[PDB]
Structure formats: structure tokens, C-alpha cells
């Protein structure tokens, strides 16, 4: 019967690892690097688009940075199509929480929900896992500014600064070196871009090969603003920090 052709996606190796999760992580390691840095007065999200073309319409393009609600955003590393399935689920969960409790969803609760969905694909159903790693950047009134990451295993952890995708080993070392706790957003912006500039596989880091976003309390009085940077605005911040 059908058993003959079953890959068995949800099994342990003799060493106690999940084959498909490990191979999905291998896939993600070839994806464009995404970086998240948390400061005292905001969060930065930086990400590298993969070998683009001159004929790609950049201003209407979105492959890395996505908005989950007004307070929370995500950076993607892996299969974009897989990520959009999960993103739309996360957008719905945030709205369900808002409808139920009449309050914006706490960042961790949203992260746990998505991570639980990823976990389910590793334990039952016989389907392949989602080949996606997220960096969650968000704000709520309990913990303030928060950075999380989740991977295909469904495991999630909190961070002050973190990278996913390609060259995370090199990127994490550079972040660990220059990061300090009393850091500010403008400094974090500079750190994120400098890290990408050194870890990139491209010859030079340009505006057309980047997606960028900030979550600031730099909004008029006690409230939070999401800023998805436009191509011209990424070009300006590259000149300002002295990379181009």
C-alpha cells in the first residue's frame, strides 16, 4: 500500500534528533541574514535580500520584514511561502486576542502560539515542518521592548541581540563584542548595518539589497510607532552611518 512511499517526517534519529527539523535548519542557514537588536528606547530589525536583480521592483517588494500588528513585527529567514502561511495565522491570533480581551496581545503569547504550531508539525501529522526561522520584534506594557526567535523545532528564546539565517556564527560574535546594555536605537541601527556589512556574502552592501525596520517609542508621547524603511530611507541611513 501507501506505506512504501512514506518518508516518516516525525521520527527521532538514534542520537535523539529530529531529522527533518535538522535539515530544515540547514535550509535556513543558506537564507539571507536577518538581525534584531533591542535597545532601551526601541528595537531594530535589519535583513539582507538574496541576490537581487536590477529589474526587481524593490519599493513594492517584501520578502524579509512583515507586520503582525501595530506593536509587533517579524523578520523572516527561510522559505518565504512557508513564512506567509504562519504570518497570516499570527495576524489572526493577534486579532482574536484583541476581540476577546479588548487589549493588544502580549508579545510572548503570540510567539508561543506560532511556536506551538511549528512544534505540532514535528510530533504528528506526517507532514514536513515549516522551513522558517523568525525574529519577533515587539512591545507591550508588561515587559516593554522584546526580541524573540523561533525555529522549525518550535523552540523559542528571548534575546537582547540575535541573528538568523546565513553566517549567524560570525554575526553573533560581532554583536556580542560591540553590544552594551545602555545602548540606544541610533547606535543599534549602526551596529546592525555594520554587522551585515561584514558578514554579507556580497561584494558590497547597498540600499537595494536591504530591508530595514524600527520599533520606537519615538512616537508623540506614550505610544509605539512601527517604521518600515523605504528604499530611499535605507539609502540615507547607509550614508549617515558611513557604509556607502
Amino acid at each position: 500500500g501507501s506505506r512504501r512511499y512514506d518518508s516518516r517526517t516525525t521520527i527521532f534519529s538514534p542520537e535523539g534528533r529530529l531529522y527533518q527539523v535538522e535539515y530544515a535548519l540547514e535550509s535556513i542557514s543558506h537564507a539571507g541574514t536577518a538581525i534584531g537588536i533591542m535597545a532601551s528606547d526601541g528595537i531594530v530589525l535589519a535583513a539582507e535580500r538574496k541576490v537581487t536583480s536590477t529589474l526587481l521592483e524593490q519599493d513594492t517588494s517584501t520578502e524579509k520584514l512583515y507586520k503582525l500588528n501595530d506593536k509587533i513585527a517579524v523578520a523572516v529567514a527561510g522559505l518565504t511561502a512557508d513564512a506567509e502561511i504562519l504570518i497570516n495565522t499570527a495576524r489572526i491570533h493577534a486579532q482574536n486576542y484583541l476581540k476577546t480581551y479588548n487589549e493588544d496581545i502580549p508579545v510572548e503569547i503570540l510567539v508561543r502560539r506560532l511556536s506551538d504550531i511549528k512544534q505540532g508539525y514535528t510530533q504528528h501529522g506526517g507532514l514536513r515542518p515549516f522551513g522558517v526561522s523568525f525574529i519577533y520584534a515587539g512591545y507591550d506594557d508588561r515587559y516593554g521592548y522584546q526580541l524573540y526567535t523561533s525555529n522549525p523545532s518550535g523552540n523559542y528564546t528571548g534575546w537582547k541581540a540575535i541573528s538568523v539565517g546565513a553566517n549567524t556564527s560570525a554575526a553573533q560574535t560581532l554583536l556580542q563584542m560591540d553590544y552594551k546594555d545602555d545602548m540606544k536605537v541610533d547606535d543599534a541601527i549602526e551596529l546592525a548595518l555594520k554587522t551585515l556589512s561584514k558578514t554579507t556574502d556580497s561584494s558590497a552592501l547597498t540600499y537595494d539589497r536591504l530591508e530595514f525596520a524600527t520599533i520606537r517609542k519615538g512616537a508623540n508621547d506614550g505610544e509605539v510607532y512601527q517604521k518600515i524603511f523605504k528604499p530611499q530611507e535605507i539609502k540615507d541611513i547607509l550614508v549617515k552611518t558611513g557604509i556607502t
Binding site: 512514506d6 543558506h30 529589474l55
Partner: protein
């Protein structure tokens, strides 16, 4: 009976590759060349009508398809897979949008829905991925003109101009030299015909080429008068004669 294939047929290999998606992309590579170019006041999509037999009536086989009045699509790869995707794309434009908001979806959202369907064939139980890459051209009020590519993985990217299939590498190079942000629609059609001639071996005329545009509203193609706000479809398929006229000024 029962569909007992409730498990994924597409899985990650040790190297991190999704084999069936890669193999689907290989099927797309073997397929006939198709392309798309975006102008300031329109979009053009084109492909070769590779007829399987001269006894076959190639007019009955439509490679370029209307999805909505302002959105069209063309493909490279497996024709039957494309045909069913067009059927599903047309339907999803109604069920998940028009029946809710009373208007046709914008290009990017219809593309998003098509992409979702193709992604599910990449993860759901007992199915292979679609063996096609789509080029979807369209217009809507708030986004203007746009051109999108959709791959077997479900990934989609917006393009100023691009090509897929047999001679895509050469065709994309040809388009990079000719494209600029000041092109008029007629100039884009001219470039489309030049680009497409390089990948075609045999006859090159209106009967062997399929070409459509997303441009100005066509009140003559609406089918009724009396409602000022309804001005007609922006999608128009060029006739055999209309193509040949532009081949003399080639």
C-alpha cells in the same frame, strides 16, 4: 480505497534542499519561454504558441488567460497544471474577495492567494508541487500597474520586467539593456516582440505568438452602457492581425 497518502511527498534532504520543488523548477526550465514587461501606462505579457501538431487548432489552446477584468496571467512549464491553477485563481478571486468587498482584488492579493495554493501543494499530504512558474500582470486603483512572478515553492516577487522558461537567462539580459522607467506601452510591446524572437526557432507571426496587455480601460469590451463608474476591462488580448502590424515596424 480512501486517500491513504496523508503524509508529505516533499521533504527536506540532509543538505536542506526540498527535492520536489527543485525538480518542479527543472520542469519549468524545459518549458517554452514566456515574458513580462511593465511600462508607465501598462503591462505586457507574451509567450510562444508551441503547437504540438499542425492539424491542431492552436487558437483553442490559450496560454494567456484572463483572471479578472484587470488581471491576466501567462506561464512556463506544464500546461495542464497551469489550466487548473487559472480555474482556482478565478474562483478564489470571487470567494475570498469579490463576494466580500464587492470589487475585484488588487494584483498583489490575488497573487498572494495563488501563491498560497501552490505552497500547500508543497506541504500537504499525498500531492506533488505544481510544475509551473506564473507571470501575473495586473492593475488596480491604489497600486497602479504591477507584474509578479510566482514559483512552484509558492514564493512570489514583483518585477519591472522578466522572463521564465527555456531561454530566460538570455532574455533577462536582453531586457536589462532595453528597460527604463520612462517606457510607454507601445515601446514595451516592441521590446517584448524583439525579446521573444530570440527564443523562437520556427515561424514568428501573429498565429504562433500569444500576447496580451494590461492597459487603458476598454468600454467597447464591457458589453453594456449606462453606468459611468464602470468603464470596462483593462486586460486585452491582442489579435493575430494586431501582432503582425507591429512586426512590420520591427
Amino acid at each position: 480505497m480512501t486517500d491513504r497518502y496523508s503524509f508529505s511527498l516533499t521533504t527536506f534532504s540532509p543538505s536542506g534542499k526540498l527535492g520536489q520543488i527543485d525538480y518542479a523548477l527543472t520542469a519549468v526550465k524545459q518549458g517554452v519561454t514566456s515574458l513580462g514587461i511593465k511600462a508607465t501606462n501598462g503591462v505586457v505579457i507574451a509567450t510562444e504558441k508551441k503547437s504540438s501538431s499542425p492539424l491542431a487548432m492552436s487558437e483553442t489552446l490559450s496560454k494567456v488567460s484572463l483572471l479578472t477584468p484587470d488581471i491576466g496571467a501567462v506561464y512556463s512549464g506544464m500546461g495542464p497544471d497551469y489550466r487548473v491553477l487559472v480555474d482556482k485563481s478565478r474562483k478564489v478571486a470571487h470567494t475570498s474577495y469579490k463576494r466580500i468587498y464587492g470589487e475585484y482584488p488588487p494584483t498583489k492579493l490575488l497573487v498572494s492567494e495563488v501563491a498560497k495554493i501552490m505552497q500547500e501543494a508543497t506541504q500537504s499530504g499525498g500531492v506533488r508541487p505544481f510544475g509551473v512558474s506564473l507571470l501575473i500582470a495586473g492593475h488596480d486603483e491604489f497600486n497602479g500597474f504591477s507584474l509578479y512572478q510566482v514559483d512552484p515553492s509558492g514564493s512570489y516577487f514583483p518585477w519591472k520586467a522578466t522572463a521564465i522558461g527555456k531561454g530566460s537567462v538570455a532574455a533577462k539580459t536582453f531586457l536589462e539593456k532595453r528597460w527604463n522607467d520612462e517606457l510607454e506601452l507601445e515601446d514595451a510591446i516592441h521590446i517584448a516582440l524583439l525579446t521573444l524572437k530570440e527564443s523562437v526557432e520556427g515561424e514568428f507571426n501573429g498565429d504562433t505568438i500569444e500576447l496580451a496587455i494590461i492597459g487603458d480601460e476598454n468600454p467597447d469590451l464591457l458589453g453594456y452602457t449606462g453606468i459611468p463608474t464602470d468603464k470596462g476591462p483593462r486586460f486585452r488580448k491582442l489579435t493575430s492581425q494586431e501582432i503582425n502590424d507591429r512586426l512590420e515596424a520591427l
